[PDB]
Write a sequence for this structure.
């Protein structure tokens, strides 16, 4: 009955198709992924952290001469290029290889961001299962998550007790390193997160989001001091590591050189540089960050690098190879693993965007890498593919309207929601702000304009604000108003609704995502452990004659073969015919055509 | 009658498809025509073309050296689409933007817009005259240097030509409007660059002599391509009369740290200006280009955003944007760079049939060392031999083959030789040991035998003896310059040959075409006779004809309005009759059903 | 502009298909066109037409009576295709063979080639004038009598019309070329045949008054329709001035033994000549025909081999062959019979769309007594009501409904009313006893209300009381002659009505048609003004248009032949139109027509 349930799934998609793939491109009918051949595992940063704790560990990073490398392929990489649809099956399977083959990596960015949501909602899989599997794959590396400040893994500031609860459960789950950020770089709103992370005695890497151009004397709102002061404020707030999160890939090489020197003088803490390659030059910036003494940098495996993802890992490493700051990673292993992600990635054809290459346009719009495609789909969905260059100009007009602000998740979305509206409804900034021009705003903008996502430097422009709220705005810390959830009473409602006790981890998924979690749960009792199925089967079922292998339980392997399918019955139901370890089964499924 | 022939072309393609596109992905049905950007209407500021004409090539190179700003060459019109779209970019889309470049980006050093693969491909695959194309660009952009890539002794072909043919082609290129010749030999052999270099100088044109980059100067485990190899070559080329020295990093192998040392040293070994061409296969080429800038390089190449990245050049707009404000800021408006790229973006979508399946950067390049312009091509050649699932084995074998030949410079045409070696090794499951095994018969490819014979020139330590002895099957090799053994072409006799096959006089340009590509050219002229001046058609029409009911506007000399009204069934004669309206007048055009 | 009209039609049909044809089967692609037999081609031997013109009808009938050989009427031009091909046979195929009949079978009594369903169906589904058709047959066979079927007061229609309309119609048919009117009444009520009969006599044409056969005179358990019933009507009709008496066995019910008896008796009962028409649904009607001959009948009907058998007439060639060398040998060249039949076979293959699925003979016909011309139609009607699989129930119900109506003569239009009643009966699952039930309300068909009111006349003993009460749901019935009650149409005015609707003058013939079939005629007229003289197109082209690249020769007038090629057909444009590209005598012509999809 574990088996009957996956069989009902891999009859249903075999007949009906996967909704997320029904009418998107198919993969070339022609090369499955092969996990490379590999001993035991060299201790790494995971063991060091256990030995030193987070304060001392960060000091260790500061003192290391080699630049330390975070691999983002398992989170930002596919979040940026494949709409975050990368599956546990493909991620888990390669963890051992990282463990054995690249044991000096600082960390693996493998959680948080859009994965929590999407894993359940679009991929029928538990994110906590994914984390665990990776923990068991790679017990010698730091597992890194991206944590949105007040916003946890969701889109709006939550109650403090919910933020506390999630962070605590994240660490039990296997997270060692929390890169945490606030979408308007408001430190007050980070303090809850930062203290929570420290309580679990894990690494709090407090991020400063980069926007503007520090070397442009005509945009002095986002000058060097603005970054060096924020660094100092975060140190005082109890940070083990400082990150520069260049979410849009705006930091240029000359700027890196200046910024990173200044930062390392402002604070004694180690610094971690994260960026995207939408410009086509982010690697120059990264290398410059390295020349300037930066302690750690993020990159993505070659196969999932470039464009709106992070810059290419292997070439970065190659560029350092032999130099004082050489990071000591085997280029032949980087490739071996890259060839794997390339084979993995071909399975997700259905999710490729039509992005052809670098775009300096990014310096105009400041759209984050991990939004670009997502927003091009909302505009194609709003019937605007043709006017897309206007959408980008709207984003930057829209951005200026708000007083010029940090655009990262979820503020990025708010500005996304505004630009789209403006193009559709043919509105200028000066119409938008006008008093005798009637326009209904996207709930998202009312939300942010009242103060639900925080407060930028000089606050919000008074006039835009009055016309959106039609409702007195507030300027305090959002969760300093928000009543504490009743964790015992918000539990009953999901245990009476799934008629089951749930895990402390399941409860956390609910806090963050009541309905997504709920719908996920109902599915798992129906279809079972679909995560254990290879990615072409999950997405397209089993072709006539085909023979599949899957492990339900460790060391228990099921041989499933689609032998036949029927025509649709007068009931409406179709019958698939299998052979489960030489034992015939008939699985009847409905026809949703 | 020019109208009759274009109609015949449209009917043919409308019914039978274009052979190069019938069976490939089509562009999106919606598809905005590329729109030439409207210009604010200011006149054309004298730029590098005027200076060259004033000072001649030497003083111009001096002027390059002394310019503080870095000078950009834009490669979109040539290396850009050679690397990303199999060189299929048409004149129609190329010439329409020339004037925009001219008005908007007047400080550019040059447009790389000619030579390379364009000469061949334009005739053989697009049915258009590359001399026409250059003429149209010349006339669009009279203030900018026009730049070609010339393969030293290999002309715009694949094989060493007689000297007097090389001389004649270079003479016609100058005449056609090339100002700046980047000239390279595939084994970096100066002895085999002298005829070309001398010919360019004799035309009072810019001779930019290239040194191809390979290996890694900063890796002491690979000393053959060390720093002193490049600086000695720079000096040898100065003595041979170069006005400019290029570093042609055809595979995008040069790393940033290596650029600091390389450009600093080059500019101390010679007073001539330096010009750096690279490729972004690694994903870090913009880093190398900036390092080269920080180190005083005089000029760098880039491609417009929309045709940059990966196997093409690194992104022009983003490189400019990174220099904005610096001492060596190149002085180019980014807004106009974005506007031109927007056009190239719309142009590029029309070429969906020729997009490769390459998803992004690859550090594997530091292993294989495939030039950017070959990669995709080789990868198709492999596919076509049923080796798609073994691409990485082909890359590995390409590296091994490289070492087996003694570690050579791989660029057109040496790179093809190595690619043929690798395909064979994989199809036939041979290791290098097998390849040179005394007990194993191997039918080496002809390009490899020809290489080892001497026909492409001498690499600096000669060819490895045992492989050579085995590949030549008894034939004696030579170490002289291949053109020293070629019979001088009988120009007058040859011109008469082609004038008789075509029953008419041909032009001096057409003759250089014939001398470089006899079959291809002859085929191109015979097509032109049948189909008229197809280059004037917009690109969708050139590849897909006209849809039922479609209205098309074309410029014969007069703008033709052409409607497709109906297409008959295939007749008893195997003919299909297309029923056009030509400016309200009815025209029935019969073509054959080639299914 | 006649040409443009035709090109529009051909464009229309080529792109959109013909509604009568688009869904049913197609003929063979290879399809040998029908070839008109070569003629040695001296003149035409004077035949029965000349005789009638010389003698007048009284004396011509007396000549028939005295004639030793049996005389033959070929029914292939009317009853043959009406019975087998839903009356869809076209003027083109019919006129083209007239001349061959004329040269090769000049001893034929007549050609049945008009009346019946042809008048309606011609205009309604074939877009052609039935008078044009009659005129063309006239032109080609001036030596043979042309014979129509007329339905008494029903005219060529389904109901009793006013007298003046019946008179006016008879006048035109005679003028148009009808020499011999076989006229019948569907309840064999002679009173209702008098107005028809007198009109025909006024025109000095032949009035072949029909007696319709039903039941079995040799079955004594069925006395109503006995030997004397028929001999009495023969006499009653002689006194009403018939020139000839027909026995019209519409359902092919007469058996050989009954013929031996019947035609002996008829000949003694009246001095008029006797003419026998039957159908071969039973698979034995030839035997009945030959028995009728043997017993002294003067004329019999047969259909050409290639349109004989089953629901049509029995086989002419084979009958003539049985009589060959006999005392009453009919003197018809069989070889020519065959040649003409071969032409009709080739003609018939063009009409594959309208083949029914009847396989062979059925004795079931003795049970249901469905006219041979109705059998298939009712079968289609029943499919249309989703009753294919119960067809035998419908056949029994027709037999049950017959007995309920008081056991009647079923022939057009009475046959049509019994049909409707049977179809209702089976759909709605009623016994006879339900239709005749007080406490079961039943919504009868419009045609049955009409018949029981008395709009088709009266049967020998009237209509059964209670069917009439329950059915008329309050209306008083009459037992008089419908025509005696119908306001006599106003002709001068009605002419104006139709002439106003067409913005043009009409002809007397056209006018007769409008009096018969107002809407159908009005529709056919408007179609002619759009599409031109489509009757002149050969049949494939009429039904299917022109294949891509196909060339067509079409005779617009006798003189002028248009060469038409279909060269191309465009995709559908944004206005929903399609342009067809024709060559007309070497000249290019765009005709636009709508995409009716
Ligand atoms: Cl939710
Ligand atoms: Cl050639
Ligand atoms: Cl009517
Ligand atoms: Mg450090
Ligand atoms: Mg300079
Ligand atoms: Mg007689
Ligand atoms: Zn990111
Ligand atoms: Zn290149
Ligand atoms: Zn009949």
């Amino acid at each position: 009955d574990r088996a009957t349930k996956l069989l009902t799934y891999l009859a249903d998609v075999t007949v009906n198709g996967h909704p997320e793939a029904k009418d998107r491109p198919k993969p070339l009918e022609n090369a499955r992924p092969v996990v490379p051949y590999a001993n035991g595992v060299k201790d790494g940063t995971k063991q060091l952290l256990d030995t030193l704790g987070p304060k001392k560990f960060g000091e260790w990073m500061r003192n290391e001469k080699r630049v330390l490398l975070t691999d983002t392929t398992m989170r930002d990489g596919h979040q940026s290029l494949l709409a975050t649809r990368m599956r546990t099956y493909d991620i888990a399977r390669i963890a051992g290889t990282y463990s054995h083959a690249l044991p000096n990596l600082l960390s693996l960015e493998c959680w948080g961001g859009a994965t929590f949501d999407v894993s359940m909602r679009f991929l029928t899989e538990d994110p906590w299962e994914r984390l665990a599997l990776i923990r068991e794959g790679a017990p010698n590396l730091l597992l890194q998550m991206l944590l949105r400040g007040a916003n946890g893994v969701g889109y709006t500031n939550y109650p403090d007790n919910v933020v506390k609860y999630f962070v605590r459960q994240a660490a039990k789950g296997g997270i060692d390193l929390f890169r945490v950020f606030d979408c308007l770089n408001w430190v007050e709103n980070m303090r809850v997160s930062m203290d929570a992370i420290a309580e679990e005695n894990k690494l709090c890497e407090a991020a400063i989001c980069y926007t503007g151009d520090i070397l442009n004397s005509a945009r002095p709102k986002y000058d060097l001091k603005y970054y060096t002061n924020l660094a100092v404020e975060l140190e005082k707030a109890g940070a083990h590591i400082i990150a520069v999160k260049d979410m849009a890939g705006l930091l240029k090489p000359a700027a890196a050189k200046v910024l990173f020197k200044a930062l390392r003088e402002a604070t004694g803490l180690p610094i971690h540089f994260h960026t995207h390659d939408t410009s086509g030059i982010a690697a120059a910036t990264v290398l410059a960050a390295v020349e300037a003494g930066v302690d750690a940098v993020d990159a993505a495996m070659d196969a999932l690098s470039g464009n709106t993802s992070q810059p290419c890992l292997g070439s970065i490493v190659e560029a350092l190879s032999g130099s004082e700051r050489d990071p000591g990673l085997d280029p032949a292993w980087i490739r071996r693993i890259s060839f794997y992600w390339e084979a993995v990635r071909n399975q997700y054809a259905a999710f490729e965007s039509d992005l052809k290459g670098p775009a300096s346009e990014v310096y105009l719009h400041e759209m984050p890498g991990g939004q670009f495609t997502n927003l091009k789909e909302q505009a194609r969905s709003l019937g605007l593919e043709t006017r897309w260059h206007q959408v980008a100009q709207a984003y930057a007009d829209a951005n200026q309207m708000f007083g010029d602000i940090v655009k990262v998740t979820p503020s990025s979305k708010v500005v996304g929601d505004m630009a789209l509206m403006m193009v559709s409804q043919d509105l200028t900034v000066a119409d938008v702000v006008s008093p005798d021009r009637e326009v209904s705003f996207p709930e998202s903008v009312v939300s942010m304009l009242k103060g639900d996502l925080g407060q930028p430097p000089s606050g919000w422009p008074e006039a835009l604000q009055k016309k959106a709220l039609k409702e007195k705005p507030y300027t305090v810390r959002p969760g300093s108003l928000l009543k504490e959830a009743d964790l015992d009473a918000e539990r009953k409602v999901i245990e009476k609704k799934l008629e089951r006790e749930v895990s402390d981890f399941e409860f956390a998924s609910y806090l963050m995502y009541p309905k997504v979690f709920t719908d996920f749960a109902l599915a798992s009792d129906t279809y079972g452990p679909v995560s254990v199925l290879p990615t072409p089967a999950y997405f397209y079922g089993l072709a006539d004659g085909e023979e599949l292998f899957a492990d339900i339980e460790k060391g228990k392997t099921l041989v499933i073969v689609n032998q036949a399918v029927s025509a649709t019955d007068s009931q409406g139901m179709v019958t698939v015919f299998f052979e489960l370890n030489g034992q015939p089964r008939r699985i009847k499924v409905p026809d949703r055509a």
